[PDB]
Amino acid sequence: GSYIRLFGNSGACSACGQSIPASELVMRAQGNVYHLKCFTCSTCRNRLVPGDRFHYINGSLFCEHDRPTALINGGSGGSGSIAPFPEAALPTSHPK
Ligand SMILES: [Zn+2]
Ligand SMILES: [Zn+2]
Secondary structure: OOOOOEOOEOOOOOOOOOOOOOOOOEEEOOOOEEEOOOOEOOOOOOEOOEOEEEEEEOOEEEEOOOOOOOOOOOOOOOOOOEOOOEEOOOOOOOOO
């Protein structure tokens, strides 16, 4: 295993992967987990906020400012995607 940076294999965000604590709520979407601080677009690094417009395509984070229009299934009369909320997912393993 090479991708394992999550103090083992409990849970981590694809942006940084620095431990998913039970204390810090994490943003979960289709089938992936992210940190509320790591919830930023990969184009302009705009933080996605619950109540603000964001884009989630192929498991990637974009924003209203970039708005990848060349490959957005549903980008018709203004896509209305809103950033999800952070909830507690899984605790990280701590090797004592
Ligand atoms: Zn993170
Ligand atoms: Zn952006």
